């Protein structure tokens with residue numbers, strides 16, 4: 298199940314992140330900085346509680362959750378959302394809902410790399426992380 302996702306990951310490729318942020322309404326100055334930032338994502342577990350940290354020189358976030366149990370979240374761009382994370386087809390699928398809108402954050406493992414696919418509206422972004 299989740300164990301192969303655990304650890305420290307560093308961003309090594311990003312496609313269409315500006316399009317995704319624009320779709321969400323993120324302002325230009327935040328997008329400019331975020332486009333050059335290379336976050337570290339740390340995924341830890343304690344029993345069935347997962348913690349996902351995203352660290353950078355700009356934004357820092359942390360969420361803790363049980364798989365399959367909804368939780369409140371405030372995103373890096375300050376959306377207040379209702380979230381759930383689950384394991385679907387071997388992928389870690391994070392769904393965020395607010396104001397009747399949705400976005401998905403899907404994490405898969407491919408050849409040892411962590412591929413994060415972000416979808417909102419028509420915008421589809423792919424970020425690739427490598428394990429530290």
Ligand SMILES: CN(CCC(=O)O)c1ccc([N+](=O)[O-])c2nonc12
Pocket residue numbers: 317318321323327328331336338351356373374413415424
């Ligand atoms: C979804 N992510 C996380 C990306 C990742 O973890 O690589 C985001 C990370 C950072 C910002 N931001 O506005 O600074 C975001 N705005 O929308 N999404 C944002």
